Design a protein around this ligand. Structure first.
Ligand SMILES: [K+]
Ligand SMILES: [K+]
Ligand SMILES: [K+]
Ligand SMILES: [K+]
Ligand SMILES: [K+]
Ligand SMILES: [K+]
Ligand SMILES: [K+]
Ligand SMILES: [K+]
Ligand SMILES: [Mg+2]
Ligand SMILES: [Mg+2]
Ligand SMILES: [Mg+2]
Ligand SMILES: [Mg+2]
Ligand SMILES: [Mg+2]
Ligand SMILES: [Mg+2]
Ligand SMILES: [Mg+2]
Ligand SMILES: [Mg+2]
Ligand SMILES: [Mg+2]
Lengths: 114, 82, 177, 80
RNA sequence: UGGGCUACACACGUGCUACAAUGGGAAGUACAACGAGUCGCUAGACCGCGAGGUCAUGCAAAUCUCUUAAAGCUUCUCUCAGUUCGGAUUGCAGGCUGCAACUCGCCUGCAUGAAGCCGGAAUCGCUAGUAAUCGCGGAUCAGCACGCCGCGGUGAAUACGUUC
RNA sequence: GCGGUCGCCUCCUAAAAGGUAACGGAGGCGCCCAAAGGUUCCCUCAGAAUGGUUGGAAAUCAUUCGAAGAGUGUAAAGGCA
């Protein structure tokens, strides 16, 4: 649709744009402000020219595969230098300073009752 | 994080050692207790034996490594698994 | 026919000159394009093969021939004669059209497309491209695909040497790596 | 060629949206829009955003900035 | 001096946030109390989307400030969706405090959006301004609370009865 | 006596026709097929190398080499490209 992702049609345009990877609520509001499109109007009602302008805005932005490759390059960069952060990534442990005796399930995965 | 105004940080003694070694054909290991030191583009090309709590572990510097605290590159504690 | 026109006009004289061909009959040319779609999943559910066949037919414009396992294999839960794998053979105008579409439209749409390999040659002058995924062909419709799949396209040419094949394919347009 | 077993196939024109570079090739898909073509013939048209000419690899010039190294980032941040 | 007490296949306790519509988002609008402040509380103004930075005011204080509290009430939007719920995890970029934030602080912006759809056996508190639920202050304190002490807002259901 | 065997097919024994015994050495049969029969037309294999998404030794595809090293419903011998 916009950048190759079929945004929801019935929802309001702000939320539909957020469904784009790399675009949050703040960025969605910003691009709608730039394009002059109302936030309430649904995408199914958005005219094609509005879509073209929004595509132009997004093209100016960096999102989707570009953003994922960038962030993964950073993580890959940490691991390749072998930083403490890289080893945290390598072993799937919290990297930002959390305690691991408990919790840490998000990074570690599911519990292994052993 | 670190305030931009304060500029980058590095221990003065460590900075002096690297500066004296700058005009060196072959960089020699720099033994430091300073974990706090940030890495600098000048630091590139050197091997630094950073104290890890019980000994100075040598670590090689490079352009990618610049911009981070030295102590991070030397893990403190060892854990192999259960 | 555009690719055929480009071949006869530019490529044929260029290759003749480069390789000092005594007679124009020596000119290497694309003989056929054999697109092969290997589907072992047909063993689990033949509908996967059905959709693969339908997508392949949409892409190629010809009803594919459904190859069958020449020999029973227990390792893959395979039985002799099972209809696993399909193919389409394109010659002449259809061959040229599909190759031209592949060069222009299909290849760029590959994610982070840095070109195609340059060592995938049989050693006689025939090339094969292993497509990792569909949806790069405009006819796939990007949504009907319940399961993403790839393919292996085989370019068979009259080139005796992989070098001639590579140069011919390059001149016809091939983003080697 | 056997009849009534193949999917429909028709000539169709292609234009590179980025540049407008035009070429005629057959296809299975059908485009509602139709355009004329030298020899005064009209065919369905498939506009293409990314084609050979458009894509940076074929041109030989790459849009992307190749990112910035950390050394230069550090120099810029701290004016060194 | 540096490191650890912050480890981490797992087990348990105590809490914080949630699983959504008696809700979330945007806008408006109203009512507290307890306590703290000299190099500290800090008004107002400038810059900053924000964290805050700058200038600068009053106050050793029923005199100035922290401090226009949040639920509330009134409009707009969302429409039952693992979502405009969720806010874990992670990348980038900042703010501060401090000689110093990597081991190893808090906070903010952008980026991402994890498990989680009301919880097995069993188990905890409470008989009224109580439970439930909502904020506010403070002690430690350069920096750092979902904990502790205290304060105030709204505000129930039930008690048949002593067999276990 | 116990065990084995009893009819039929294939090989060796079997001494280059045929036949030829042993409680000699090896295996098969008591069916199957409505095409796996008839005829007309057409086709040539097994493997190996090289290349190739899932895919791996090995599924499917292509080129080359490859005279049989395959297949011939069912044992073996003979025979068949
Ligand atoms: K920790
Ligand atoms: K716990
Ligand atoms: K316990
Ligand atoms: K807690
Ligand atoms: K509401
Ligand atoms: K820290
Ligand atoms: K619970
Ligand atoms: K404090
Ligand atoms: Mg988004
Ligand atoms: Mg911590
Ligand atoms: Mg402790
Ligand atoms: Mg739900
Ligand atoms: Mg009581
Ligand atoms: Mg209360
Ligand atoms: Mg005889
Ligand atoms: Mg005889
Ligand atoms: Mg037969």
């Amino acid at each position: 649709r916009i950048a190759g992702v079929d945004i929801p049609r019935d929802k309001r345009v702000v939320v539909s744009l957020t469904y784009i990877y790399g675009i949050g609520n703040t960025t969605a509001k910003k691009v709608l402000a730039n394009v002059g499109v109302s936030e309430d109007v649904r995408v199914r009602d958005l005219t094609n020219e509005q879509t073209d302008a929004i595509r132009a805005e997004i093209d100016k932005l960096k999102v989707e595969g570009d953003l994922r490759r960038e962030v993964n390059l950073n993580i890959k960069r940490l691991m390749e230098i072998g930083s403490y952060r890289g080893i945290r990534h390598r072993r799937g442990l919290p990297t930002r300073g959390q305690n691991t005796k408990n919790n840490a399930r998000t990074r570690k995965g599911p519990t292994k009752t052993v | 994080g670190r305030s931009l105004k304060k500029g980058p940080f590095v221990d003065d003694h460590l900075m002096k050692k690297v500066e004296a070694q700058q005009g060196a054909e072959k960089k020699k290991v720099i033994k430091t207790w300073s974990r706090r030191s940030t890495i600098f583009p000048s630091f590139v090309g050197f091997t630094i034996a950073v104290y890890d709590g019980r000994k100075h572990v040598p670590v090689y510097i490079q352009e990618d490594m610049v911009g981070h605290k030295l102590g991070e590159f030397a893990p403190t504690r060892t854990y192999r698994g259960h | 026919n555009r690719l055929k026109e480009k071949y006869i006009k530019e490529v044929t004289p260029s290759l003749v000159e480069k390789f000092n061909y005594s007679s124009v009959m020596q000119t290497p040319k694309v003989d056929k394009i054999v697109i092969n779609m290997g589907v072992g999943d047909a063993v689990s559910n033949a509908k996967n093969l059905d959709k693969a066949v339908e997508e392949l037919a949409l892409i190629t414009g010809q009803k594919p021939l459904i190859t069958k396992a020449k020999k029973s294999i227990a390792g893959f839960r395979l039985r002799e004669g099972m209809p696993i794998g399909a193919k389409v053979t394109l010659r002449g105008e259809r061959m040229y059209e599909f190759l031209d579409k592949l060069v222009t439209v299909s290849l760029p749409r590959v994610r982070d497309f840095h070109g195609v390999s340059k060592k995938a040659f049989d050693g006689r002058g025939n090339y094969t491209l292993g497509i990792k995924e569909q949806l790069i062909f405009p006819e796939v419709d990007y949504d009907l695909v319940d399961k993403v799949r790839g393919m292996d396209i085989v370019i068979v040419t009259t080139a005796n040497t992989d070098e001639e094949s590579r140069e011919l394919l390059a001149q016809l347009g091939m983003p080697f790596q | 060629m056997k009849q009534d077993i193949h999917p429909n196939y028709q000539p169709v024109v292609f234009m590179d949206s980025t540049t407008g570079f035009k070429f005629l090739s057959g296809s299975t898909k059908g485009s509602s829009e139709t355009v004329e073509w030298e020899d005064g013939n009209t065919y369905p048209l498939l506009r293409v955003e990314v084609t050979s000419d458009s894509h940076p690899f074929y041109t030989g010039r790459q849009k992307f900035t190749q990112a910035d190294g950390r050394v230069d980032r550090f120099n810029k941040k701290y004016g060194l």
